[PDB]
Write a protein that binds this DNA or RNA. Sequence first.
DNA 1: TCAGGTAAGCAGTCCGCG
DNA 2: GCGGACTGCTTAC
Length: 903
Amino acid sequence: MKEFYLTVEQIGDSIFERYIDSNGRERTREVEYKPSLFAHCPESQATKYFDIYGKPCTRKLFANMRDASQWIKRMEDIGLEALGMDDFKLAYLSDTYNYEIKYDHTKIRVANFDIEVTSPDGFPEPSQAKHPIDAITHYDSIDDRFYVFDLLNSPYGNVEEWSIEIAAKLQEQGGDEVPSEIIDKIIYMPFDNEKELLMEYLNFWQQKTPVILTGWNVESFAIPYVYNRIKNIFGESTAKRLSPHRKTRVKVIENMYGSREIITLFGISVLDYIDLYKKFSFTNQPSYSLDYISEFELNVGKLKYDGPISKLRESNHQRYISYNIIAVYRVLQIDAKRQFINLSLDMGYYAKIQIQSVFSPIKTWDAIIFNSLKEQNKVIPQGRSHPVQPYPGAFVKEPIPNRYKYVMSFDLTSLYPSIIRQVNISPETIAGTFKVAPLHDYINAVAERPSDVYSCSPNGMMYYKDRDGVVPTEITKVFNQRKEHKGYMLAAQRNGEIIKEALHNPNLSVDEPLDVDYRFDFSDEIKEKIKKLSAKSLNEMLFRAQRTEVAGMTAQINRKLLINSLAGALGNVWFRYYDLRNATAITTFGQMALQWIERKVNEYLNEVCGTEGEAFVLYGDTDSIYVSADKIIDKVGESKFRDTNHWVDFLDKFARERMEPAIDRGFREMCEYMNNKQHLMFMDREAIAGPPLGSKGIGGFWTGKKRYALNVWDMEGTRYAEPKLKIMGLETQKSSTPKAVQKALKECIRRMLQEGEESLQEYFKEFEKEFRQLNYISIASVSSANNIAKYDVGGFPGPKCPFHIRGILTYNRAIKGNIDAPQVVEGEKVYVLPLREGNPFGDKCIAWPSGTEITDLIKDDVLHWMDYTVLLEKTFIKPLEGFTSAAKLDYEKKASLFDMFDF
DNA sequence: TCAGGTAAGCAGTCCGCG
DNA sequence: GCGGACTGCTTAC
Ligand SMILES: [Ca+2]
Ligand SMILES: [Ca+2]
Ligand SMILES: [Ca+2]
Ligand SMILES: [Ca+2]
């Protein structure tokens, strides 16, 4: 089989590589790699190396990597560009693996782990590491085994051996409910003493050294704790055994106030699952506890225990150990669903980077382009210093706040990447500039045609049409991968709606799930078989359909993020190909495209209605338009439609057969106008929105830019079994909005769009009646807390102190001596509650770490001094007043005199 | 901690305002 | 009270 690398590090003049050989085996080698960099040479030296601009360069092959980095510095102080790959381990992989890598994940050791530490004096600080490590669970992907290291004897308590039998039992039964399917995969190892546990945990680590190391907060807690504790007990060097090359780099001290620790282990790729999740999941969560993410992702219950975690081992050692095991498995379960490890490996190997570099699209693109250019004997330019400068982005139309009954939206496929490819935007394809007319003049096709020769953007930039730039070329490859994955994702989505529909009339039989591939649209045969299936079978098929969609999503949305990040990276000063003339060439072209097509759609729809100057496009943002379909419905009748699906069908047919071809001609003309390389402005119908036929629903509403709600029946060709609310930007969508209030507001909106005003009014009264009885957490606001030290003058609130930062300082002055109180962590999220004046906390709000209950000692005083009135007004009533007034509806009646009375 | 991006809404602070 | 200048935060794209 084909060779592939696992990890690569540069340690002095040595490249340290772990890899898989042609026989499927893991090996390791130290290489004194001889790197090459480049200088511009006179037009006399018959060389085969040229820069991207086509200017000759002489190759300089250094004896070692120290001399190369030295040469770079000497070139700088001489004022001359030193061209080539300055990150030598990237050059090394390029040379060593000069082909498209075909990797085998089965041969990659993926390890998932976590530890436990009992601490009777606050959060067991990883930097200090003064409390014994009393549990470690380590899952090895290759063995498929959960290795459990359990400490029986400690200064903080002598405990009994963990029991797999009790662990397997359900919590209803007094067990711990360790999932049944991993019980036979647990290798349990107990210990008389902390030293012999750590030594054995070092041995096995050498025997089964992780390539990919992950888990939950492993970079921030587990890795620095295991390192530092072995450092405090055995010393250094023995601690360095965690590295296959026995080289670590402690950073780290990030104060104030303060004061944490981060460890780099050379030869291991640390992909903290929390960081994978933040980057690739496309969520923004109110909490990042494993308990909260697991519930969200997997619908599993929280890991409940009695009393503080500082006394859990002592009071229930059994549960302590089970919960440590379960924590490790939850990350595996989250990953089986989300498949971020798979995604990290796909990308890392495609770019030929260290896998942990997939967090950086600048690194990723730098290596993709480097490899692309090297393969053509081209030489990459030196990275340069640039000042951070603002630059313009997208156009967003100002909507008239109103209700909008029937709406069809249209949106461009992969806009910024498509623009890159259409205009041929690249560092080396810059041809020149032209005199820029105001944007409005290009939008209205009245300005002089910019060029008859080059491919233009309305920001004044001209590009060669003839040759293909490296940026278009490489963005195209990844776009085509995204297209394929998105194709699978939408098929699984359509298939999911087929099953949901069938679930309306499930059959009374038994009966097995059909053995189908959910990535492909169901055939008629399969759809007929589906209509005959039981609920049980249908439900299992739905789960599989949704799992397939989710995998499809991860694959597609993160390739979209990658190619979009190339557009953004042209505007980041740390990118080798940073160029604001290219970054704005995209954004400005996008502004023109949107407004150009708004004009063409209005003109077409006016033409077909035989009118003039009516505005049909009601809104647009970046690359999308929203078109009022009222007249289209009202012209044919409304009573002529047998059902909702009949008019959805009608609008679908209209957009496809009438509007899309008009849109197609419009954009083709724009391409000619800008004399672009390739027409790639492909705008397809996205949403079809409206109220249920015969209802009093308002269908949709806008309050302002980036703030609207729509009742959608079809999204990009997915005909839903039940209408879906597409709500953008409103409080329902915000992670700062209380949990209960998100749901309440969504139901307010549902009733507005589907059922109408009386229905809303009925619901409002119900929620206002129940509010005070809801759980304090579910009704608490959420906020990230940055720069706490900046507004800490007391610790009392300083000048212009943010409301939530005030809450945090009010918190800190209540849990002063409390050793068992959780500390707010700079950058993390907090719940925030208003307090009634006169309260004992001495301020108008209290904030505390999100995802946790507030401490026992102060909990009851928060509850008694909570200001429900101010809370209900802030989080529920005020936003709702925004929605309803834009929609021209009331959530409440009158006031006003009577009353009437009954007696 | 160390390197995609901009546009833009709302919560809240502070203060001007006869 | 409301509004404008401003910071902070979180969203749409
Ligand atoms: Ca789009
Ligand atoms: Ca099968
Ligand atoms: Ca049926
Ligand atoms: Ca869009």
